[PDB]
Amino acid sequence: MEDIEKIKPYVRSFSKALDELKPEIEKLTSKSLDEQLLLLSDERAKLELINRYAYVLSSLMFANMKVLGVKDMSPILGELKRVKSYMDKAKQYDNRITKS
Amino acid sequence: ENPDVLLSRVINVVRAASSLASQDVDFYKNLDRGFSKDLKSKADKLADMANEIILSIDEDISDLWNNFGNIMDNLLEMSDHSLDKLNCAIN
């Protein structure tokens, strides 16, 4: 090969995505999580915000590890699975409520 | 339609990182000093946002990852507790 020009746009798309990500992160972190929870009364709404927070951090850690050139994504993949597990419990709970 | 911009943005980053990772980045990173640099900056940019999330919660590599496992554990327990309480109130 020796041709880097093909590799560069991959990065640009990545950087573009990161810039796009920042404002959203600032919105999320505009208040501490605990302060956000207080601003909620619905237990359901609370569970949602938390699962979301777990999702973003895990994903951002995942993306980090990929770019680092980490071969093995299993520790993050394992944690990501665990998060899905808890997100799954949230939904099945909803179904139980619906039937109720 | 309640669409989540944040989650959509998060996914774009993962795709972008992943797509980036598929290339022989190590080959170019080692080949070109200029490339290595920007790349670290973008990763740091990604790193900055992730630590900001951690700063929001506020509850050596070995020593480091261990620390990450600890935060995920903190988040997931709050969640389990939230779930346990809904299940209890129903029951």
Partner: peptide, 14 residues
Amino acid sequence: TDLFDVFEETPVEL
């Protein structure tokens, strides 16, 4: 739709 699919899917490498 599943959010986690993004982890599995293959990149658009040249």
